[PDB]
Write a protein that binds this ligand. Structure first.
Ligand SMILES: Cc1ccc(S(=O)(=O)Nc2cc(-c3ccc(F)cc3)sc2C(=O)O)cc1
Length: 560
């Protein structure tokens, strides 16, 4: 079973593509080494196709079936509801890819008769037809990165028509939003805010007599997902207490879309056929998480890991267990990897045991420690700032659908780099354009949110605590990583950011209201004589319930 079969037709762009970093009057204030930043384009799609195309083989043992039985038992306690057409329409991002049937996302959100009538016809077809493959479009993603030691090819996105996507929501939004946590419990990563993820990892690490942990990187996970895997996923969904109509729709979507289907480029030409995970469907996140959890849990048993605790976020996996010594741990990991491989999940980078929690990277992030105003140790989530800064550079010269700088500030507010650079840089820009009150779209765990920059102090306090505005004395390793990134990209030093931050702060304070609050809390680090920094009122008015519940990457979800 080949993950993909190709016809030879190219994966084409739907518009002009820029690979080199766009430069404007503000670029140099952020970084000088422009040539280090690039965006992937359809021109490298061929390289990616070669990487993701291969045969899959699976050998399923009793551990695999035992874990699946446990998962099904838990799934049977779930009761999910079908979404109405309007509810599903409201979850559609305003700028989602238009339908080829005469209507767009805007029409969907407005509940226009034409869009609504077509959605109903698609739904009706799903109930009556459970065998005809559904068409999908394949595109090369345009993403920004920084040249790495060891340029990456564009990732591929595969998605069905807008009408089908709305139907996916009606049949599965509730399921993908609630089933994972019930089945995986504390191992389900998307139920945690950054701070809660740290808490879980730290408490788990402390729960072992001699902790040992490792991250497991499956090589091209989506391509390793087999027909068996996708049918097993469906069998789990079907354990739920569902309306018969939902069961039919889920069965149909699985047979006609999730298992595989024809691939069409932006020009309308047949590019080939997919027999693996589609990266752009509602169940991509839930499905990968379930499958990764199933295989990893079985592998932990096959390798005889002692008290293994897992944390899974889609294809991202981390395991923390009881150490049996350096030599034995190395042996256990090899067996774990052999098991994963038998399950069709071979590693890209071979896993290695770590005995220092800070050195374990999962979800492209790691736990580190700093100190608050009181001098107390505070654990927080951070990550290598390279990609975040590369994308900020792009966003500095071009307006984009997703403002990664905002999402990164939200998720990494306590970090040295987000505070010193991202906050300072963008608030200066917002001030100059008098766009402080303009809400911006960003993404959290794949879902899109419209957020007002002025609400950041409230958001940060609620999610990270007041200490996020006073962290200092960062770790040697974190300091070295940030310093390295600044040199690599050619970013101005601390003295320059502090100077700018003092100016931005002074300007915000003069604005009063929420702006003044942003200046007081976000930039207290820049002043020589720090201020009070006490709780904030309004903060408790924003509804943050739903932000960290489930993953929706590739799911075309809008939460507002
Ligand atoms: C957000 C923030 C908080 C504190 C400071 S600081 O200058 O007081 N002290 C500190 C500055 C650091 C630093 C390290 C590497 C760089 F490439 C730039 C700055 S690390 C640190 C520390 O306290 O451990 C700056 C920025």
């Amino acid at each position: 079973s080949m993950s993909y079969t190709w016809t030879g037709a190219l994966i084409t762009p739907c518009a002009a593509e820029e690979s080199k970093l766009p430069i404007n009057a503000l670029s140099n204030s952020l970084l000088r080494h422009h040539n280090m930043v690039y965006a992937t384009t359809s021109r490298s799609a061929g390289l990616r196709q070669k990487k993701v195309t291969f045969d899959r083989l699976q050998v399923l043992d009793d551990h695999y079936r035992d874990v699946l039985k446990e998962m099904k038992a838990k799934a049977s306690t779930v009761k999910a509801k079908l979404l109405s057409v309007e509810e599903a329409c409201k979850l559609t991002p305003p700028h989602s890819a238009k339908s080829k049937f005469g209507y767009g996302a805007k029409d969907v959100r407005n509940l226009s008769s034409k869009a609504v009538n077509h959605i109903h016809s698609v739904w009706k077809d799903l109930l009556e037809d459970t065998v005809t493959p559904i068409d999908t479009t394949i595109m090369a993603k345009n993403e920004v990165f920084c040249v790495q030691p060891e340029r990456k090819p564009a990732r591929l996105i595969v998605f069905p028509d807008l009408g089908v996507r709305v139907c996916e929501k009606m049949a599965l939004y509730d399921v993908v939003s609630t089933l994972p946590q019930v089945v995986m419990g504390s191992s389900y990563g998307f139920q945690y805010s950054p701070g809660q993820r740290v808490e879980f990892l730290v408490n788990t690490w402390k729960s072992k007599k001699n902790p040992m942990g490792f991250s497991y990187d499956t090589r091209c996970f989506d391509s390793t997902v087999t027909e068996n895997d996708i049918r097993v996923e469906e069998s789990i969904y079907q354990c739920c207490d569902l309306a018969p109509e939902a069961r039919q729709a889920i069965k149909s979507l699985t047979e006609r879309l999730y298992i595989g289907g024809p691939l069409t480029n932006s020009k309308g030409q047949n590019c080939g056929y997919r027999r693996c995970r589609a990266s752009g469907v509602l169940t991509t996140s839930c499905g990968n998480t379930l499958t990764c959890y199933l295989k990893a849990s079985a592998a932990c048993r096959a390798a005889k890991l002692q008290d293994c605790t897992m944390l899974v976020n889609g294809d991202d996996l981390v395991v923390i267990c009881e150490s049996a010594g350096t030599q034995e741990d190395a042996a256990s990991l090899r067996v774990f990897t052999e098991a994963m491989t038998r399950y069709s999940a071979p590693p890209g980078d071979p896993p290695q045991p770590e005995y220092d929690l800070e050195l374990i990277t999962s979800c492209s992030s790691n736990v580190s420690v700093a100190h608050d105003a009181s001098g107390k140790r505070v654990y927080y989530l951070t990550r290598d700032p390279t990609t975040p800064l590369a994308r900020a550079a792009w966003e500095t010269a071009r307006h984009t659908p997703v403002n990664s700088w905002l999402g990164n500030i939200i998720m990494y507010a306590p970090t040295l780099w987000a505070r010193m650079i991202l906050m300072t840089h963008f608030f200066s820009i917002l001030l100059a354009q008098e766009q402080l009150e303009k809400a911006l779209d960003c993404q959290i765990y794949g879902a899109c949110y419209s957020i007002e920059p002025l609400d950041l102090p409230q958001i940060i306090e609620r999610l990270h605590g007041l200490s996020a505005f006073s962290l200092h004395s960062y770790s040697p390793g974190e300091i070295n990583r940030v310093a390295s990134c600044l040199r690599k990209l050619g970013v101005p030093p601390l003295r320059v950011w502090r100077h700018r931050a003092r100016s931005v702060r002074a300007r915000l304070l003069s604005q009063g209201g929420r702006a003044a609050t942003c200046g007081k809390y976000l930039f207290n680090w820049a002043v020589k004589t720090k201020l009070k920094l006490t709780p904030i009122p309004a903060a408790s008015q924003l509804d943050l319930s739903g932000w960290f519940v489930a993953g929706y990457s590739g799911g075309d979800i809008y939460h507002s």
